[PDB]
Amino acid sequence: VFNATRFASVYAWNRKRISNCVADYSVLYNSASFSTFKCYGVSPTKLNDLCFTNVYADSFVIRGDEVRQIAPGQTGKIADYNYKLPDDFTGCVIAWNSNNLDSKVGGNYNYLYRLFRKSNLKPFERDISTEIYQAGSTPCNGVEGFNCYFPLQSYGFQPTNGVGYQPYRVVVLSFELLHAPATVCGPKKSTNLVKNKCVNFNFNGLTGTGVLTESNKKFLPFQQFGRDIADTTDAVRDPQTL
């Protein structure tokens, strides 16, 4: 999604559903290859230690002056009619300048946006309908005429324009947690295994304190841990090394 070939429009933002995987979030925070990094309700330093049911990477492009409208509970033409964020948005929004990638000779006019809609969209909603609306009862039904504006306006992304007009590839990282079990987690940074030393351990499922040492025992291919007769952990299998 970060290195995608091209981003969609702001009214037809592509909802990239991601589930059943693990990936680092601070890798982008400490990348120094972004123009905007502002999370809402969660810090990027702690996001690695949080699990969620599913996440969405909403890809779209907007102008530099329009990035201010991408926020939870913020009004605007692209916030109310193209892509609204909820008041309880516990995700993160990121963006980066794409003037050297999305620009074209004389300006890229392929990107579009919904200038207005009859009603405001719900959070995490997109509308690709080209239906036009009139002021009075005069029916247009397709082509324009007699004050029935066309809602989808085109973007002007010139290669030599100011920073407020250059294209910015935005990626809204939404997070969701429901009764279903959490599938999207971050990486748990492991340490070097120390043997024959009384050291505290923190394995995949079990934790404790004791002397870590190998033996001649053989667990089954699926058995990850081991306990004695009294339900006390007596042996384990290292998650990294079999």
Epitope: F116, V143, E144, G145, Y149, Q153
Partner: antibody, heavy 117, light 112 residues
Framework: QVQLKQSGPSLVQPSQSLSITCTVS????????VHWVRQSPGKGLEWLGV???????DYNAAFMSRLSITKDNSKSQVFFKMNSLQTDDTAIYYC???????????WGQGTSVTVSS | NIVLTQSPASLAVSLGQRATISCRAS??????????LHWYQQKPGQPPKLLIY???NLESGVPARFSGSGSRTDFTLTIDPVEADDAATYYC?????????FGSGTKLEIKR
């Protein structure tokens, strides 16, 4: 890239007809509208008509029966049939790309049509 | 013929000042949720170009100083800070009612 310069007229006499061919460039003629105006004949800037995105045409109250727009999608040329041109109608005609809210985003250089005996 | 009384006819604005160009209209309002119009700028050696559509949006090519607002009848353009590159006439095109006539034309002069 985006240029709608006009061509075709050389000299007009009073009470005559003549068409103006406007070059199309920078957008698809089949899905974008084309406006037509003059250049301040006396009072401020005026408006003549418009060809919508593949539909019908609208014109001013006074130029309803006199001026007409004809969009040729095969040749990518927009013709502007004029009728009953008087000496007071001397002005520069411009073409422009139709925007979202009936706006005129980009413009062309146009051509000066001189009406005189 | 929509009578878009754009006033004043011209202003001599110096560097680092604010320009004011009014636009009064009657026909009409309630397009979808607002009743704003478009603005333009014509240099003496170039045709006009769209600056502000619906009196609330910017356009690529010019800086962010071009902004404004307006009531149901009167509309105002705000250029702040004005510099020595604004020798051009500004117009007001109505979009809520036909015909799409323009304003009288306010020519800002570089007061040097």
């Amino acid at each position: 890239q985006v240029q709608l310069k006009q061509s075709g007229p050389s000299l007009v006499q009073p009470s005559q007809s003549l068409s103006i061919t406007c070059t199309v460039s920078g957008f698809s003629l089949t899905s974008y509208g084309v406006h037509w105006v003059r250049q301040s004949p006396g009072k401020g800037l005026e408006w003549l008509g418009v060809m919508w995105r593949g539909g019908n045409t609208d014109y001013n109250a006074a130029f309803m029966s006199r001026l007409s727009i004809t969009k040729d999608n095969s040749k990518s040329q927009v013709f502007f049939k004029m009728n009953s041109l008087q000496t007071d109608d001397t002005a520069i005609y411009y073409c422009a790309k139709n925007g979202g809210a009936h706006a005129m985003d980009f413009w062309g250089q146009g051509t000066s049509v001189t009406v005189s005996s | 013929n929509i009578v878009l009384t754009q006033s004043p006819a011209s202003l001599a604005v110096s560097l680092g000042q604010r320009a004011t160009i009014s636009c009064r209209a009657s026909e009409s309002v309630d397009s979808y949720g607002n009743s704003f119009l478009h603005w333009y700028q014509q240099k003496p050696g170039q045709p006009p170009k769209l600056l502000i559509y619906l009196a609330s949006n910017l356009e690529s090519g010019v800086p962010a100083r071009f902004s404004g607002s307006g009531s149901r009848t009167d509309f105002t353009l705000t250029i702040d800070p004005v510099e020595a590159d604004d020798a051009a006439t500004y117009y007001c095109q109505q979009n809520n009612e036909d015909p799409f006539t323009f304003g009288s034309g306010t020519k800002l002069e570089i007061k040097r």
